[PDB]
Structure formats: structure tokens, C-alpha cells
């Protein structure tokens, strides 16, 4: 199917408690494969998936060089943004950045991404054209001017269409037994009375990969969006994910309700009912 690679950088200032922390993690789809943390006793790029371990010393050395350089650059950037917003030196602030490439089911580039935030709000993003920027406010417009002057977009584009795709394809091959395996949800419906005249039906999905899934309840074939309690998809810790969706129904009407499950790992969507 379709696949993506993303890197997630977080740089966080903490006045009075040392220099800002820089952390980078890398993902292919929902599988993390590297980390770097400037607060580690000996900061270095570390493997987080078995299939990346085969990369040679030069790979790890280059990654670590890059992340050490970024640690310093992002510290300067934090300083710069504090000034752009006329902020005091007292507060803690965060730059986040997420970038990477999406491939279609043929392995071809679908599109690239390179987006940044400041204190959790959109700051600047590379447009889908990989050539122009969208700045969120007059501060980010300063960054935009700087990056336009230095032709930064051209360099980001070169990476996103080149090395990004090339490495993602390599990772997909090296990790093909896991990265290219969809594990379907294991499903069941539970029933608990909430009183004499109502009961909760809960539709479960467990053990699935990747995390993308759709779980819905219908009553008489009609979507029950407003009446359904849906929890956030959550990681099990063994690579797989879990989710449930619950509806409270009048006692005696249980068979009018159906749970529908869509997942990459399923040929055809499932329809489930409570089975007393």
C-alpha cells in the first residue's frame, strides 16, 4: 500500500535549567526507527527498529553529526523567535518541526511535507509545490524572508524528492516483513447494562497495524455518530494498536445495532453484532 517517512523534531527552551533540549525521532508509517536526544548522557543517534541496525557506522556518524548541528541551530532559532514575538527571557518555548515524504502504492512520490510550529501553533510550512511558503503571522514572515533570500525551499525540495524517497524505499525493503505487513483487527462486542432499561454495547478492535482504522456503530443501518463514544486509537506496546466505540442502547433493541470495521488488513469491511 501507501507509505510515508517522517522526522519529528522538538526544541524546547528552559531558562535557568540549561540550554534548550533538542530531540529528533524518525518514523516509517507507525513504526519509529531512530532517536536522538541532546539530554542523553552521550547524545548519539540510536536505532529503534531491528531493520535499521544493519546500516553501517557511516550512517550513524552522519545522523549524529546532523542532529548535533541541528541542536545548535535550533537553539539559535529559539532565540530568534523569542525576539520576533517580543518575548521575555523568562518563559519556556517550543519549536516543533515535522517533515518527510509520502509514497503511493506504486512507490512513487505522492507529495512532500515540511512544517513548523511555535508553542503549538502553526508557524511556517512548505507548500505542496515544494517551492513557496505559507507563513502564519508577521513573525513567520521574517523567517519566510530569510528562507526566500537563501533559497531554502530549493534545498528542501531536493531532499524530499530525492534522498527522502530513496531512503524510504530502502527501509521498506529492509523491513518488508513488518513494514509491508498489515495485521487486521481482532474484534468483539461486549454488553453491559447501565440500568434496567439501557445497556452499553462496546465494539473492540485489538492487535492491528497500521493505526489507521474506522470503527462505527449503526442503528437500523444509520450512522450513530453523535451517540457513539469513540476513544483515541492507542498503542499496545507490541507495535499494534487498539480502539473501541461504544453506544448506549434501549434494552431489547440490541440487535438493531451493528458495528462496522474498516482496516487495511481486511479485504472487506466487517459487520459485527452483540452475540448473547
Amino acid at each position: 500500500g501507501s507509505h510515508s517517512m517522517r522526522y519529528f523534531y522538538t526544541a524546547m527552551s528552559r531558562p535557568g535549567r540549561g540550554e534548550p533540549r533538542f530531540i529528533a525521532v524518525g518514523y516509517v508509517d507507525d513504526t519509529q526507527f531512530v532517536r536522538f536526544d541532546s539530554d542523553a548522557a552521550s547524545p548519539r543517534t540510536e536505532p529503534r527498529a531491528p531493520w535499521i541496525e544493519q546500516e553501517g557506522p557511516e550512517y550513524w556518524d552522519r545522523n549524529t553529526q546532523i542532529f548535533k548541528t541541528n541542536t545548535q541551530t535550533y537553539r539559535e532559532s529559539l532565540r530568534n523567535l523569542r525576539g520576533y514575538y517580543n518575548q521575555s527571557e523568562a518563559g519556556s518555548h517550543i519549536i516543533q518541526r515535522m517533515y518527510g515524504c509520502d509514497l503511493g502504492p506504486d512507490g512513487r512520490l505522492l507529495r512532500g511535507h515540511d512544517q513548523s510550529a511555535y508553542d503549538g501553533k502553526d508557524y511556517i510550512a512548505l507548500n505542496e509545490d515544494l517551492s513557496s511558503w505559507t507563513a502564519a503571522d508577521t513573525a513567520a514572515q521574517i523567517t519566510q524572508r530569510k528562507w526566500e533570500a537563501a533559497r531554502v525551499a530549493e534545498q528542501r525540495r531536493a531532499y524530499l524528492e530525492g534522498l527522502c524517497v530513496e531512503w524510504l524505499r530502502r527501509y521498506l525493503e529492509n523491513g518488508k516483513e513488518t513494514l509491508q505487513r498489515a495485521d487486521p483487527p481482532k474484534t468483539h462486542v461486549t454488553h453491559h447494562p447501565v440500568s434496567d432499561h439501557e445497556a452499553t454495547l462496546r465494539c473492540w478492535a485489538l492487535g492491528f497495524y497500521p493505526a489507521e482504522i474506522t470503527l462505527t456503530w449503526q442503528r437500523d443501518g444509520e450512522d450513530q455518530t453523535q451517540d457513539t463514544e469513540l476513544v483515541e486509537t492507542r498503542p499496545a506496546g507490541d507495535r499494534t494498536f487498539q480502539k473501541w466505540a461504544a453506544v448506549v442502547v434501549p434494552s431489547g433493541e440490541e440487535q438493531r445495532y451493528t458495528c462496522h470495521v474498516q482496516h487495511e488488513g481486511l479485504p472487506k469491511p466487517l459487520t459485527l453484532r452483540w452475540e448473547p
Binding site: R62, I66, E76, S116, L163
Partner: peptide
């Protein structure tokens, strides 16, 4: 693999 030189310029 992360991007390298394209990340040289500060914000």
C-alpha cells in the same frame, strides 16, 4: 535518513 545541509539556515 534526515535532511542535512538544507537545515543549515536559522529561523
Amino acid at each position: 535518513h534526515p535532511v542535512g545541509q538544507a537545515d543549515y539556515f536559522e529561523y
